[PDB]
């Protein structure tokens, strides 16, 4: 009956496409055509951080917009003070191959993960005075690509096993598993209300998941691997930067592809995607060794950072919008303003 | 202008930087290697050989030192077939060790395809490959039987003659070496099809009982270091 199931699936996919086209009366560019452009957005490298020894694969800001954690292939997880360049912590990882780092909203814990398939959660507010591995979540069957905190006790982790997981840290078990993707899930963004999250994978498709219920609400379709994903500040849209030199903006309430940010002179791959606080600026890091700032509504380039010697592997905008931190494969983080 | 606490924080940062400089010296003095191969290929045998004689976990590490030079060799398990996404973590490894089972001709063609994918990879475009054509005691026992001819799997073998070059000095049947050199050339051609800096393939013939694999790796890595010295320091 596999033929019958495949035919029903094809008919349902065609119905989804027809319904999605029935709501595309106007395109985002048409509505945005009247509002004035941002103009040149020139941001200068204020503070540069020179502690790591190898390529930086991830960063994450803290909710205080002051501290930030960076993970390097040298087996180090450095918690930096942005304002003073001071190094607050230097956690030595048990595995040197780290692809993701997360800073808990409370500032107490910091998460790392990579080829070891383990999500290592480290405690920073211990009475002993040294950072210790609080827990090691060890249920994945593939490399960790992204970990984000929901609170001090729950984490969400995307892995190369085509599955995402929601872990209760104290129990150490996968509370929920998300099992829709057909390829390596490479990025992950958590909604501001922390009830939904979008995951981008190598199947050229993003998927929106309900954390509480475990299901996949809706799937958005790109023509290469989606390497970065980030919600709009609204919580009703998100952006996916992929291996083809495109960052696409989708909207949940319409189940569409609102805009496609691309340029004929960009042939590299987007590694990281972030939004400005207003949501009007979409910052994307590229293999071209530089970050491009797009206008998220007019779909035109607004600026170029261009201060790195190797590919920009991580990007993050603070909660207060003061700074955009870029981490590249040259062991340097740069705080642009 | 800094406060007392700010000065203490700066001093703590300088202490962290000192430990980071020590870790930098340790990280530089060690050579990272990546070990690839198929399940058929004898690959855990090689890690055992260079360990003894010198769960769902993903990365396996096998440290070993040769002539006071430390090597960290990484094997990647508990990962699926797709490799294009975690292979980027190995842009800076000194050498990629590829183990190909020369005994099995049926799976040989896909071994060449994996080698081609590794060789022509945008991230390993500057990464040398040390190639181990493993399980050759089984190759001799297979070619001295006549029940499996390479022509049944590689049609070009019938028109191949051993080159007027090196030969195994000890007693080896002159068509054992013909087949072995054909397997070698099938990889050497792919290596020389698209060559660049730091991108050179070192082919070696090995077995499970062989205890000299570590010396081979050390010599090849020394040559890789010499080439990077000749390039990054403008000598070529």
């Amino acid at each position: 009956e596999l033929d019958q199931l495949r035919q029903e699936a094809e008919q349902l996919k065609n119905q989804i496409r027809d319904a999605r086209k029935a709501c595309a009366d106007a395109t985002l560019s048409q509505i945005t055509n009247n509002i004035d452009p941002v103009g040149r957005i020139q941001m200068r490298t204020r503070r540069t951080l020179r502690g790591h020894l190898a390529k930086i694969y991830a960063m994450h800001w803290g909710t205080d917009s002051r501290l930030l954690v960076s993970a390097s292939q040298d087996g180090k997880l450095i918690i930096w003070d942005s304002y003073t360049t001071n190094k607050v912590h230097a956690i030595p990882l048990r595995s040197s191959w780290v692809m993701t780092c997360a800073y808990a909203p409370s500032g107490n814990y910091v998460a790392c993960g990579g080829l070891d398939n383990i999500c290592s959660i480290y405690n920073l507010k211990t009475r002993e005075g040294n950072v210790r591995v609080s827990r090691e979540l060890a249920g994945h069957t593939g490399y960790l690509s992204c970990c984000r905190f929901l609170d001090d006790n729950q984490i969400v982790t995307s892995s190369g096993d085509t599955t995402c997981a929601l872990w209760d840290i104290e129990t150490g078990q996968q509370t929920t598993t998300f099992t829709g993707h057909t390829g390596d899930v490479m990025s992950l963004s958590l909604a501001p209300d922390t009830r939904l999250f979008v995951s981008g994978a190598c199947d050229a498709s993003a998927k929106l998941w309900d954390v509480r219920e475990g299901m996949c609400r809706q799937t958005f379709t790109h023509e290469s691997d989606i390497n970065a994903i980030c919600f709009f500040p609204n919580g009703n849209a998100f952006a996916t930067g992929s291996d083809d030199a495109t960052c696409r903006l989708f909207d949940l309430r319409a189940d569409q592809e609102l805009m496609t940010y691309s340029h004929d002179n960009i042939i590299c791959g987007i590694t990281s995607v972030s939004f400005s606080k207003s949501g009007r600026l979409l910052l994307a890091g590229y293999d071209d060794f530089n970050c491009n700032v797009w206008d998220a509504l007019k779909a035109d380039r607004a600026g170029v950072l261009a201060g790195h010697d190797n590919r920009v592997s991580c990007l993050g905008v603070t909660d207060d919008g003061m700074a955009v931190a870029t981490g590249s494969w040259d062991s340097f983080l740069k705080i642009w303003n | 202008t800094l406060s007392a606490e700010d000065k203490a924080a700066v001093e703590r940062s300088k202490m962290i930087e000192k430990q980071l400089q020590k870790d930098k010296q340790v990280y530089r003095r060690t050579l990272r290697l990546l070990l690839l191969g198929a399940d058929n290929s004898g690959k855990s045998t090689i890690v055992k050989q260079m360990r003894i004689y010198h769960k769902t976990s993903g990365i396996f590490e096998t440290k070993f030192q040769v002539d006071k030079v430390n090597f960290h060799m990484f094997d990647v398990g508990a990962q699926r077939d797709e490799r294009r996404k975690w292979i980027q973590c190995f842009n800076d490894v000194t050498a990629i060790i590829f183990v190909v089972d020369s005994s099995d001709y049926n799976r040989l063609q896909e071994a060449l395809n994996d080698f081609k994918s590794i060789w022509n990879n945008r991230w390993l475009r500057t990464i040398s490959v040390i190639l181990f054509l493993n399980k050759q005691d089984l190759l001799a026992e297979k070619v001295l039987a006549g029940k499996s001819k390479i022509e049944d799997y590689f049609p070009e073998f019938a028109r191949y003659t051993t080159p007027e070059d090196a030969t195994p000095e000890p007693g080896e049947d002159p068509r054992v070496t013909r087949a072995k050199y054909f397997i070698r050339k099938e990889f050497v051609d792919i290596s020389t099809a698209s060559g660049d800096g730091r991108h050179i393939c070192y082919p070696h013939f090995t077995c499970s009982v062989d205890t000299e694999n570590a010396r081979r790796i050390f010599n090849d890595c020394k040559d890789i270091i010499l080439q990077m010295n000749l390039r990054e320091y403008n000598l070529v």
Partner: single-chain antibody
Amino acid sequence: VQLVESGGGLVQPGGSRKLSCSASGFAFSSFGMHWVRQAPEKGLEWVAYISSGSGTIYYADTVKGRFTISRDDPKNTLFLQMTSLRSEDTAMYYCVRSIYYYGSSPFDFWGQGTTLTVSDIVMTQATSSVPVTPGESVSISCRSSKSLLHSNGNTYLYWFLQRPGQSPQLLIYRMSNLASGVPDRFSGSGSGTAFTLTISRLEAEDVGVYYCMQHLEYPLTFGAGTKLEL
């Protein structure tokens, strides 16, 4: 965390004595270490400070030259070598743990102290004794001759509590933050040169002497301390 100090006793004036505090239960090598003292019936007075890595040592004016502070990190023990003692140096000496980074709380743990008997941002706390009854809010005020609001943004005031017959315990660090393990009823507020600690719904086992300590510039100055009695 545990931190036990020993080496006290009777010293004839002009002698020399080595106090040693052994720290067990935390990363001693990554914490700065202070030596403070309390006279037989007086307030706290900072003596010395040895930084992590032994790269920054500070002494008090009434202490410089006579006293040498040092630490043995592998053995996890800090030593105060006191030379040419005087009658004014008799005190219970406390060894104070203190780490320094962004968000850190210095002066968390205090030792049990060693009794030794020998045979400047002035901080004033006018209330030397405030009568109190359990269940009522209390306010202890401290002033300073120099504003503690540094240009970075944070004021470096520390509120300590010393229960009868016990070592001082940190209550508030940097004038608004609450220490780890202290009840939420304690609150700190104020501006430079004027600070107030408010205990809402005082409950016994919080009576004792309350001290205010400045950390803007060395030497660190304490206060007389308000004595809350039930």
